[PDB]
Amino acid sequence: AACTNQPHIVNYLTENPHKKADMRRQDSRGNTVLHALVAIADNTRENTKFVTKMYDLLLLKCARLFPDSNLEAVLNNDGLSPLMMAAKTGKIGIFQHIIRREVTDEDTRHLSRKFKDWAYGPVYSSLYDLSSLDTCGEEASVLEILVYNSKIENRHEMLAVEPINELLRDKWRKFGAVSFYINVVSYLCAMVIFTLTAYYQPLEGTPPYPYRTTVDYLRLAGEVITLFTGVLFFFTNIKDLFMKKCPGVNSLFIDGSFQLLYFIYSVLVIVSAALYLAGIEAYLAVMVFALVLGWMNALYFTRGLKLTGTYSIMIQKILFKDLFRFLLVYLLFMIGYASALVSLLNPCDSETFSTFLLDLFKLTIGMGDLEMLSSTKYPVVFIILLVTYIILTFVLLLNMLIALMGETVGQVSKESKHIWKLQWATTILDIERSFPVFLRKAFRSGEMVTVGKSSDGTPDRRWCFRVDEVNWSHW
Amino acid sequence: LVLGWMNALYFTRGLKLTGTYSIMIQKILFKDLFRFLLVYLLFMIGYASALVSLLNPCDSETFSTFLLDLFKLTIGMGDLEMLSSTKYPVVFIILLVTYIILTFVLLLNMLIALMGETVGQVS
Amino acid sequence: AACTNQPHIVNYLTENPHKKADMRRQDSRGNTVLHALVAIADNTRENTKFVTKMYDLLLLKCARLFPDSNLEAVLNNDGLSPLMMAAKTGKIGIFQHIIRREVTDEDTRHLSRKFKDWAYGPVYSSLYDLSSLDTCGEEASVLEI
């Protein structure tokens, strides 16, 4: 009845002399009336009005009939609440209303979420409530669900709400900037140490090597530090994976690529160690690749910077999606032409094929010499085919990929401000979540204002957060 | 002398036909190119250090000569002869290919995207 | 009172049998009533109208009460005037109005900044004033700022 916009039916059914349908009743899924109302909620102009009206009416009735228990407290089997479910489903229309819910009624004004602090002239300061909007690990928070979760219809719009922006700003100012630069400095120092260790690697001798000289004191420390740092990265990345209740593939592979890369960096660095103990000969081959990957995956720290925040996100986006889609066609061309040219030539075979492929790649770059035609028969058709290869690839494809690449960068330019805000929020939340619980509680934000008293008179004493704005038409 | 010749665009600022050019080249140079060059330098440092470490001579002069050769390659000229002396040549070529692909194909002309967007704002 | 859009309060306070608040009064910063009015001025449609109305009313009252001294002449500690401060702060709404201020009143039309030169058919020639808008090094100019 509630989902079908029939207030009279709901009113009659709630209070009937024969039977009553308690509003705090859960189905098999665990969803109660508010859960279902949010589920059918839509962002359309007409639907939102009636959804909000029915939600407020039902919540007020439930509070009036049962003053001890709050209806929104009930959770479904998934553990989410109507606010959290609305945030996860991307239904801004009901979410924004729930965030700024204010009740004028004196009897049941306690359940309001937005209070008025004071007005001085055009300046108005209002005190929002964030008891469940921000949690220091005690329970799931709306902010983490809104940010980390993927495939949300209106994530960017829901992030731009009155309390969210101010809370992110305050959290960033309080400790985010202090620890972000410490992070950058420590990581860069570790990378420099790793590079110096890699350079001063004794090729002569069978690994492991004896350490007797003065330089050995310094050289061994670099390897030990790098190995311990890799192990620490692996432990951090397993702890984080379990912290988010084991996010699936969609969380790791599609987005947040850096969360996966450090895992790879975590593997190779330790893998080499094993070889360094037994597989002495070929530990450099993988150690150098680990070093290259570590150097290349430092854009996670650049994500935060406003000036260069977009660059990392858009290079990661374009690389896997545009370049690979183009590379499919490019590889079709490469395979066809290379096979044709290899077949055509007459030597009078694996080594010859490899050498020809090397020569053709060197040509593909734009350097080298065209000497292969001398030995082969039918040189004219060979040159014609080479010309078609060069024309097609270089002239058309090489710089026609640039068309959609520039279009992608154009989309990113059109949405640069919005994406930077998301990335900055992600990095600051990331940094926060690694802190210990007790320290996080010590860094709690907000006040303990006793705005109102309960029905029995006891003080609510709930955590809140105050903001202010300016209006000139309120005369 | 070079700086004096290069800093004559102040007088070209006035001309209506070429007034924008100087302002927008000064704007793009310090803001877009440097922001891109941060990432490019990350790539350069990582790959150059890796390649220098990998090679087996059997050191400052050798490192400088290798860096010169690698820069000459980076332009698009020179020859790929270093692989002969080093061990594990196949991984060396793979790493060089990744270097060339990433930088030249993606970054070299993806900077052009936001550069053209900047020139679009100026237009 | 002026910044809060209360013309009646300003009128009463300016002329009261008990005490009077002179409009050419400077605070610690040096900003006078016009300076403060410009400071809170905004480019919004509603704010600009009342800001300009109050500015004109207060300037006319000050000129009427004291004909010898012009209120806009007073400078703050920074040395700027309401026109210069508006130019520096980027508040176009009050700036454009100040530039083309024209007073129809005969008694106090001297303080106007835009005059009419002559009209020939559709052509209209008007004579603006730039006494402080352009300065040859004598004092800071709006254009340079």
Ligand SMILES: CC(C)C[C@H](NC(=O)c1cc2ccccc2s1)C(=O)N1CCN(C(=O)[C@H](CO)NS(=O)(=O)c2ccc(Cl)cc2Cl)CC1
């Ligand atoms: C200790 C706090 C004051 C700050 C904390 N930094 C660290 O703990 C360390 C930094 C460094 C640098 C050099 C050597 C050793 C360490 S230990 C910090 O702020 N963060 C770490 C947790 N974070 C992560 O684990 C992301 C998000 O889950 N995953 S990741 O991409 O794989 C990653 C990113 C950077 C670092 Cl570094 C380690 C990792 Cl797995 C986020 C960000």
Ligand SMILES: CC(C)CCC[C@@H](C)[C@H]1CC[C@H]2[C@@H]3CC=C4C[C@@H](OC(=O)CCC(=O)O)CC[C@]4(C)[C@H]3CC[C@]12C
């Ligand atoms: C355009 C791109 C994105 C697609 C091509 C992928 C590259 C990574 C391929 C193109 C040509 C390949 C090369 C062709 C021939 C050789 C020689 C081969 O070893 C030899 O020198 C052969 C001599 C012998 O074994 O006797 C090792 C790999 C290499 C460099 C291949 C490694 C990978 C390369 C550079």
Ligand SMILES: CC(C)CCC[C@@H](C)[C@H]1CC[C@H]2[C@@H]3CC=C4C[C@@H](OC(=O)CCC(=O)O)CC[C@]4(C)[C@H]3CC[C@]12C
């Ligand atoms: C892509 C760009 C924007 C970043 C790279 C900066 C360039 C200015 C660097 C790249 C390689 C560098 C060169 C690498 C090696 C050398 C040799 C060095 O002197 C030598 O010839 C070594 C011989 C010896 O000392 O015995 C002088 C600098 C030079 C040309 C370096 C000067 C600066 C270069 C050109």
